[PDB]
């Protein structure tokens, strides 16, 4: 399923809820059309890898989550596992998500 985090507080709760499952976080800006437009692959993959938890984060409504990570550009995807960050990359490349997931699956 997809989970929307509107605050860092929920971000920590979500990381704990995923447990040992892979966790991908999208920092795309909802106000930015080019970034939101890429949400279908990110969101669609949630049903492709239902064994992986996908989080969507708004740098504008969830700037507390993004400010903590010092995001310098969007869209940015971050990978977390067991509450541990194991990967990150930027660029509107949806296929790239598939490779990193397979790499950490």
């Amino acid at each position: 399923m997809v989970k929307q985090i509107e605050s860092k507080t929920a971000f920590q709760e979500a990381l704990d809820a995923a447990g040992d499952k892979l966790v991908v976080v999208d920092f795309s800006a909802t106000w930015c059309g080019p970034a939101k437009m890429i949400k279908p692959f990110f969101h669609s993959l949630s049903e492709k890898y239902s064994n992986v938890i996908f989080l969507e984060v708004d740098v504008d409504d969830a700037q507390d989550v993004a400010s903590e990570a010092e995001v310098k550009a969007t869209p940015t995807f971050q990978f977390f596992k067991k509450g541990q960050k194991v990967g990150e990359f930027s660029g509107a490349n949806k296929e790239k998500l598939e490779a990193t997931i397979n790499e950490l699956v």
């Binding site: 800006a29 106000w31 930015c32 080019p34 970034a35 740098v59 504008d60 700037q63 995001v71 310098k72 550009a73 969007t74 869209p75 930027s90 660029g91 509107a92």
Partner: peptide, 13 residues
């Protein structure tokens, strides 16, 4: 200098 593939934070937001 502005790439559509990336949104710049320079935006007032």
């Amino acid at each position: 200098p502005a790439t559509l593939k990336i949104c710049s934070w320079n935006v007032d937001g």
